[PDB]
Amino acid sequence: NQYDNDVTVWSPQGRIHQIEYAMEAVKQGSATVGLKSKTHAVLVALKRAQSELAAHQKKILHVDNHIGISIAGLTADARLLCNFMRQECLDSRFVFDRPLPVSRLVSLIGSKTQIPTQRYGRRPYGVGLLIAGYDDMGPHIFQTCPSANYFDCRAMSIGARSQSARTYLERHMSEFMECNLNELVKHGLRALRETLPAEQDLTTKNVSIGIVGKDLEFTIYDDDDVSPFLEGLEE
């Protein structure tokens, strides 16, 4: 009623509806999925076009040589926060001269989203993030929330209809560790299929991926390299 007008005012149950409305803003975006092995990490992003004549939007943003991220949420809220993520990673190589640990970057992402919450007049950032990266300890899959909560993950699927993918991620989780780069793409694209409708399924136009690895830096694939990846995969 009167308690949804701002973030600061607590509900009689001790909840903030504006944070809830920010967490429901992320679920209105595109559905992306990602996973990691004991060696590599693959981020499968679903691209959607505004119209039939319009080209597909870019859901993948390059951050660091070993780091990549997929955005789901308000587009511009991701952009301003992407300028914050890239600045902190550039500051890491500007100061420490090393790739910023992916766990340290996400902790800075939450601190940026904790600032608007406790203050009146500030809106929280309504974009969610699925970020991946490789370091001395191996690849890592991290997820963030507009509530500022962030978790460490083996594999996750965000967006609409993500449970059909997450259920797939639960059954094959045993295989995700020992598969190699070519199989991670096969499991990643087949995991994307469950978030997709029953009509439009898989085309190299609206489907793009990215891969980071042991000695392999993060690389974005679009069409030419994705076409043989889709070949040889049943649905």
Partner: protein
Amino acid sequence: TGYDLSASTFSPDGRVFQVEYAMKAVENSSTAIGIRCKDGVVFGVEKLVLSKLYEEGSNKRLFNVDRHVGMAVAGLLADARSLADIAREEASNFRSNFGYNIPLKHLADRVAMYVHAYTLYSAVRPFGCSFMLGSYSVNDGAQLYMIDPSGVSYGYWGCAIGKARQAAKTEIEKLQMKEMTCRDVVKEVAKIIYIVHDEVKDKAFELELSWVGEITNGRHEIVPKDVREEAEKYAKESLK
């Protein structure tokens, strides 16, 4: 009525309901307990498994504010990590000021003062998290303090935060915790964790334990997996 809208506006009975509602949010958080003895202070936390899709070690509920100072928070995780770094800034600025580790009573005061500062202003919101602060030293000894959402600290021989608290506090009163040693106290901590959790609403969980005292040489340290499993087997003697 409009009286509970802002924390700066008092109720007709002379109370602030905004601070009260922040306390009700703490009651939904998972249960965390701690006990101090002559040997040190023992920590424990119930970490609920939300899904099997989460990596081991995720959502760590054992917070380390300072080398000799451990912390366990039950409440909003967003305000938890906020105050976590802020409490570390106060301990770091203390060392940058007085050149040693801040005592637990002095640290609990400065942190609680900054919690109460947001209850006065209507342009901000009070913290929705409550936490306990343990410490150990050779001059002071084992000490345990808990800070509520209203920013008031109380000394405790033991405390419980989260959903189930009064039930766990009475179980601690039934036996003397002072003469015990942290090896025997963690046996009771794991025993209480199994009593608090049953299968009704929640599904699965994991035991997160921490020690400070003579065993850890006065430094905040997590319990290893080897001792944790052995400490569970001592509780499995009776629960099972």
